Design a protein around this nucleic acid. Structure first.
Ligand SMILES: [Mg+2]
Ligand SMILES: [Mg+2]
Ligand SMILES: [Mg+2]
Ligand SMILES: [Mg+2]
Ligand SMILES: [Mg+2]
Ligand SMILES: [Mg+2]
Ligand SMILES: [Mg+2]
Ligand SMILES: [Mg+2]
Ligand SMILES: [Mg+2]
Ligand SMILES: [Mg+2]
Ligand SMILES: [Mg+2]
Ligand SMILES: [Mg+2]
Ligand SMILES: [Mg+2]
Ligand SMILES: [Mg+2]
Ligand SMILES: [Mg+2]
Ligand SMILES: [Mg+2]
Ligand SMILES: [Mg+2]
Ligand SMILES: [Mg+2]
Ligand SMILES: [Mg+2]
Ligand SMILES: [Mg+2]
Ligand SMILES: [Mg+2]
Ligand SMILES: [Mg+2]
Ligand SMILES: [Mg+2]
Ligand SMILES: [Mg+2]
Ligand SMILES: [Mg+2]
Ligand SMILES: [Mg+2]
Ligand SMILES: [Mg+2]
Ligand SMILES: [Mg+2]
Ligand SMILES: [Mg+2]
Ligand SMILES: [Mg+2]
Ligand SMILES: [Mg+2]
Ligand SMILES: [Mg+2]
Lengths: 51, 103
RNA sequence: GAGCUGUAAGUAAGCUUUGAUCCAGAGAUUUCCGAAUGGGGAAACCCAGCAUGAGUUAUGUCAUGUUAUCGAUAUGUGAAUACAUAGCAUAUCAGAAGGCACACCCGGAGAACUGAAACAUCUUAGUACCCGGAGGAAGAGAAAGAAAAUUCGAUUCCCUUAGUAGCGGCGAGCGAAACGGGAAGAGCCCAAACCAACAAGCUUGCUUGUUGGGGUUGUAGGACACUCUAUGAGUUACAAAGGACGACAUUAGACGAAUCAUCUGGAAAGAUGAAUCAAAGAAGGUAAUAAUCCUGUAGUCGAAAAUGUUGUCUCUCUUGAGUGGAUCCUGAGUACGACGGAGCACGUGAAAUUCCGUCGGAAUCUGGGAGGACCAUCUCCUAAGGCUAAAUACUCUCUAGUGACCGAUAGUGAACCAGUACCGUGAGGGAAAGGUGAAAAGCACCCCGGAAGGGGAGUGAAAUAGAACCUGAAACCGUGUGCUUACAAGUAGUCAGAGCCCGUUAAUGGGUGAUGGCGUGCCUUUUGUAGAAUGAACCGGCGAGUUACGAUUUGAUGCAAGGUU
RNA sequence: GAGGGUAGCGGAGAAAUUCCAAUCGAACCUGGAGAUAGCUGGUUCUCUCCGAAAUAGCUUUAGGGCUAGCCUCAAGUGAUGA
RNA sequence: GACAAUGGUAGGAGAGCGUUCUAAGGGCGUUGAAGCAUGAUCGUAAGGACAUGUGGAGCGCUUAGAAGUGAGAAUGCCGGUG
RNA sequence: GACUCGGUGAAAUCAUAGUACCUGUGAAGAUGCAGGUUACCCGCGACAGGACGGAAAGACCCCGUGGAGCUUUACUGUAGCC
């Protein structure tokens, strides 16, 4: 949603995983990936900030 | 990072899997030499030392990273990690047995 | 933490657990020329003096100190002249000189080529060269300002104002500013009146010259009188200066997790299968392409020493607020004006503000300036004395990095013992030249030859990889060959077609050609070219509409009387 | 023959435009500097569609330029063109 | 199935192959990669393949970007050979 | 010296070349074109009529709104001097 002391610091070794804070949502990776898995706390925010 | 009085087992060479001892290490070329491993025959001519010198058969140098120092309590090759106890640093063979294989 | 004695193999003696060689901090050594400085001088040399000392019976020699010029500080001495001053003689001092990356800055001095389609005012441009002085940043700077509403407030820099107001042989072309949005935010010390000593004239008076202390601004501050406050703030970059008490950053280095087996192979890191760590799947090396073989990375620690930031205390320092303004002071040859001139975006014009040269030349708080000449009224602010951090401009280097940047005719000129060979008297020009293999295993031996080379043998997966060394294309010079040529007129082909030889990415097959038709190469340049017009000896390699900023246009895509940073 | 002096806007000359590091109507070496050039030469891969002019006016202009004229895509107007 | 049109310079307008690098996806590589030589094959052009030798290690193909992108002439430059 | 044999061995030039003459046509003077005529392949020794032969991006002439040096009662300036 805004930070992760571990999720930003786990998953940094595996090939094919990106861990991005919801205000750093660019457009290349979100169509480079094939599968959005988001927390339920940021999902309510992205409509409250893009619409 | 081996020493001059160890007894090791190679991994990848022309003769792999053979044991043996180390007699020199050459720590600027980092290529070590083992008895009975990779004979390289020389055509030495008649010199002022060898009276009518000729062919011979002497093992010569190979790299460090084809050579792994094996566990003395198990005889299976092993990475060596280091830790230090009291004043100096000793070699644990990372199979829970520290070796004594210097001399 | 076990080998080392440079690049650099070979030696031959040696060093090394009693801790070498290397890595970091600190100290001793530091010959000689160089600003060269004891005098000379062709830079790397020559000749001395002065004290001490070695030495010889002395003379010759040697050794370490010592003596340049300005400048300063102290005595000596002191002329033409008698009083003193230049002058002269000794002793201390280390102040200067030279060099710098001269990249960036500040002042002194300062061209032309070119554009105007020529050229003189203008512009190229106050640009390049030259010289002077400093710094890690210099300059600017605390309103004699901007402004016109309601005012806000030191300087610098970025975006817009805007290619607008304007300047101009009104041509080419130059070209602002404030308001606004931000970056980063400190303001202060002297001069004077007056007062307290000191000295002098020359007396208990005055004047003058020092020393403190007092004091430094315009809503007018200060002197002088009135009354009331003090061991609480401020600081070693501005404001006055030095230094002990105590957290980090640099200059070496530690630890650092995870794998096997088969196959082809000279050798696996590859293929197939079975596993494992992961805050570690950055990167390179290892006989091919490795997260788990090595050096490493993520994350953690270390610092005898010596510097840099610095937090704290310790020290220096230090009284600050109000009123009366009935008197006294507020930066003199200054501001201004006349005369020629430079700068202000502004070419002397209607020309303010700004500095220099020559010459005349004010008033002082009822003052003095400035609001694009000047006068009047109204608003603003107090020159002729000083000091100043941050925002910002630069890299010859140092540390750690990154790149739709080059991969040896590219990249720096310079990957290679490069500003070197080499050319020039000189100042100065200025090249070419990378690759054996995994490892030197660098061909023992046999044979011809004086040797160089060569054929065998031999190492190696490969020597058709032999130290002119990976790969080896074209020009070009050669070797036996299948068809074809000695009665022939030729930009060399093409289209018919006989005979003889070979059999394909198997298709209306490939090579050769006795004989017939048809016919003057290519590019630039031209009214026109085979042209006797130009250009090319041939084969490789290199070698010519690009980028930033804008303006206008169609094509695209958002939004719609709204779009946009 | 040996030492020495005069340096480019300059020097030397029994004067010729002679001499100044195989030269000179103003030496050489860097830097402004990729000066400017209305002038020559050069400009690299292929195929489809359409395809001119060498004239007029004015110029320190006649081998250069600007505008009209003649071609080309794109929109329109659409019966004006032969 | 028609129907017409297709010489061509300066020049204007479209559709295209190839070279180097990056991004993503998907592959081939010691049972032999890129280049090099040879061949009677395929596309309308530029060009694309496929076997066989030599070669010893890093390349293609589709999509989409960015440009130091193509050679026969400059009395071109450099190195070779006549 | 040239010439023959033994030694060593360059250069300017050069689009490719198996390179005949006549009359004519042509950018108006042809080894290459039309029409004839005459000639087997191959080298050495000489001669100089051609190949508008080589050597120098014609100095002569004429152009450029190109530069230089010189002159004068050209224009505008300036060191000096009264
Ligand atoms: Mg050695
Ligand atoms: Mg000296
Ligand atoms: Mg003595
Ligand atoms: Mg701020
Ligand atoms: Mg380790
Ligand atoms: Mg490890
Ligand atoms: Mg004036
Ligand atoms: Mg090469
Ligand atoms: Mg060399
Ligand atoms: Mg063998
Ligand atoms: Mg060949
Ligand atoms: Mg004929
Ligand atoms: Mg023409
Ligand atoms: Mg000819
Ligand atoms: Mg020629
Ligand atoms: Mg004459
Ligand atoms: Mg003479
Ligand atoms: Mg030039
Ligand atoms: Mg210029
Ligand atoms: Mg046509
Ligand atoms: Mg056509
Ligand atoms: Mg076009
Ligand atoms: Mg390639
Ligand atoms: Mg060529
Ligand atoms: Mg020539
Ligand atoms: Mg002869
Ligand atoms: Mg001869
Ligand atoms: Mg004729
Ligand atoms: Mg004739
Ligand atoms: Mg002859
Ligand atoms: Mg002759
Ligand atoms: Mg000419």
């Amino acid at each position: 949603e805004n930070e992760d002391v571990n999720v930003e610091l786990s998953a940094r070794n595996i090939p094919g995983v990106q861990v991005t804070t919801a205000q750093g949502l660019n457009v290349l990776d979100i169509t480079n990936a094939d599968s959005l898995v988001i927390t339920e706390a940021a999902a309510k925010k992205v409509e409250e900030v893009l619409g | 990072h081996i020493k001059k009085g160890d007894n090791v087992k190679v991994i990848a060479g022309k003769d792999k899997g053979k044991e043996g001892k180390v007699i020199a290490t050459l720590p600027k070329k980092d290529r070590v030499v083992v008895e009975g491993v990779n004979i390289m025959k020389k055509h030495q001519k008649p010199t002022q030392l060898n009276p009518e010198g000729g062919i011979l058969e002497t093992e010569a140098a190979i790299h460090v990273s084809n050579v792994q120092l094996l566990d003395p309590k198990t005889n299976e090759p092993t990475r060596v990690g280091y830790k230090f106890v009291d004043g100096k640093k000793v070699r644990i063979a990372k199979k829970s047995g520290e070796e004594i294989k210097s001399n």
